[PDB]
Amino acid sequence: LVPVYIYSPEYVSMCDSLAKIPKRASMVHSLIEAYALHKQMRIVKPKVASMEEMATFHTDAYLQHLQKVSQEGEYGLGYDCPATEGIFDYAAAIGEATITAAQCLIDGMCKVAINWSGGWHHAKKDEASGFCYLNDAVLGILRLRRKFERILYVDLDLHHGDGVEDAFSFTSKVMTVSLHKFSPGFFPGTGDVSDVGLGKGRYYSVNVPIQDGIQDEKYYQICESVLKEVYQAFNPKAVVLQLGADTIAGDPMCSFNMTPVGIGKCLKYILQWQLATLILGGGGYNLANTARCWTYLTGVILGKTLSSEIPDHEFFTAYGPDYVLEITPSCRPDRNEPHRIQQILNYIKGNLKHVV
Numbered sequence: 040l041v042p043v044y045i046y047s048p049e050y051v052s053m054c055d056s057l058a059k060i061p062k063r064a065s066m067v068h069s070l071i072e073a074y075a076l077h078k079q080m081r082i083v084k085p086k087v088a089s090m091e092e093m094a095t096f097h098t099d100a101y102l103q104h105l106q107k108v109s110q111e112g113e114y115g116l117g118y119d120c121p122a123t124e125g126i127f128d129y130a131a132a133i134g135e136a137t138i139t140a141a142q143c144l145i146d147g148m149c150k151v152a153i154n155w156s157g158g159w160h161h162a163k164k165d166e167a168s169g170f171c172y173l174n175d176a177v178l179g180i181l182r183l184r185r186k187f188e189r190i191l192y193v194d195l196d197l198h199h200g201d202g203v204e205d206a207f208s209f210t211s212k213v214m215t216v217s218l219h220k221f222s223p224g225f226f227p228g229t230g231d232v233s234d235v236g237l238g239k240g241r242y243y244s245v246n247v248p249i250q251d252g253i254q255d256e257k258y259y260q261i262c263e264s265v266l267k268e269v270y271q272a273f274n275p276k277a278v279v280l281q282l283g284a285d286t287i288a289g290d291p292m293c294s295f296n297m298t299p300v301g302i303g304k305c306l307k308y309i310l311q312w313q314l315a316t317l318i319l320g321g322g323g324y325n326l327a328n329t330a331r332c333w334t335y336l337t338g339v340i341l342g343k344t345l346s347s348e349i350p351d352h353e354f355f356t357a358y359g360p361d362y363v364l365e366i367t368p369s370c371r372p373d374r375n376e377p378h379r380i381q382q383i384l385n386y387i388k389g390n391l392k393h394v395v
């Protein structure tokens with residue numbers, strides 16, 4: 040009944056080296072450790088990544104070139120995803136880490152496994168996209184697929200989980216549900232409510248297009264409404280949960296207006312299903328707030344109430360000016376007109392009626 044926490048001093052050090060999120064992995068672990076939460080979780084070292092376990096989703100052709108430019112140095116290797124040194128080994132490390140957590144859920148080692156450094160949901164099978172070179176979420180889903188008949192992927196990141204959805208857009212055995220911001224010109228541009236999948240996978244993709252400024256209460260009523268209908272029609276045997284923290288107030292994305300407590304409500308509702316759940320991180324570019332969020336969420340999984348005051352640790356100075364765990368919503372409008380939100384939920388309710 041004890042959650043597995045994918046951790047390794049070398050692993051965090053590798054994730055620290057990630058270009059867009061310096062030392063973020065350490066900030067998260069350090070803060071989690073500062074609350075002594077790791078003393079209540081089964082700490083598991085991530086396995087070593089092989090080329091063969093990455094090839095279960097990504098093409099050989101893409102994997103060769105990705106490792107090649109990683110040695111020294113098309114395929115989406117530009118813009119947000121520039122070819123940099125050791126990017127293969129970093130991407131593969133996280134890819135393997137998520138697979139390790141998926142493996143633990145299979146062995147019946149636990150009901151919940153955690154890899155906060157994962158959740159890179161934009162990578163296609165043969166294309167790098169949106170800081171994502173390898174798609175660890177997919178790899179984990181494929182691993183869970185060996186034991187569990189139906190997999191449910193819930194993406195609570197600010198951005199649409201296009202990579203994971205595209206990977207399983209033709210199957211009914213893996214259902215993806217993504218709550219994200221949707222507005223012309225906003226990355227990645229896909230994920231409208233009309234996006235329901237293709238082939239036999241039709242109606243087994245769910246996207247919830249949301250506008251700026253949404254807060255906890257409204258977000259949960261939206262999220263729970265959908266998840267109630269999804270769990271009813273799909274009856275999942277396992278869940279992969281992506282909890283990107285770029286939805287939290289104070290994030291440089293300045294889009295949604297969420298607090299960790301809001302996301303926690305969504306997490307509490309999913310955990311109450313008593314299914315094998317794989318918890319993933321993702322976005323979150325306010326490094327301190329991202330640490331605040333996932334630490335609180337770790338406590339939510341553990342069913343513990345955390346002290347409001349941030350304890351002193353290596354990154355204590357980065358938690359000004361209040362040095363508390365809570366996060367206050369920004370005083371800016373919620374751009375979600377109640378009518379449109381209602382129209383979307385009906386569009387989804389209708390789509391879910393097709394699920395047998």
Ligand SMILES: CC(/C=C/C(=O)NO)=C\[C@@H](C)C(=O)c1ccc(N(C)C)cc1
Pocket residue numbers: 119160161169170196197198226283285321322323
């Ligand atoms: C890819 C992404 C988030 C992905 C994510 O979070 N996936 O989960 C965000 C991009 C669009 C972005 O917003 C951006 C902003 C500034 C910038 N420069 C100032 C260079 C470069 C990129």
Ligand SMILES: [K+]
Pocket residue numbers: 194195196197198199200217218219
């Ligand atoms: K999302």
Ligand SMILES: [K+]
Pocket residue numbers: 207208209210211213214215236240243244
């Ligand atoms: K699907």
Ligand SMILES: [Zn+2]
Pocket residue numbers: 196197198283285321322323
């Ligand atoms: Zn994001």
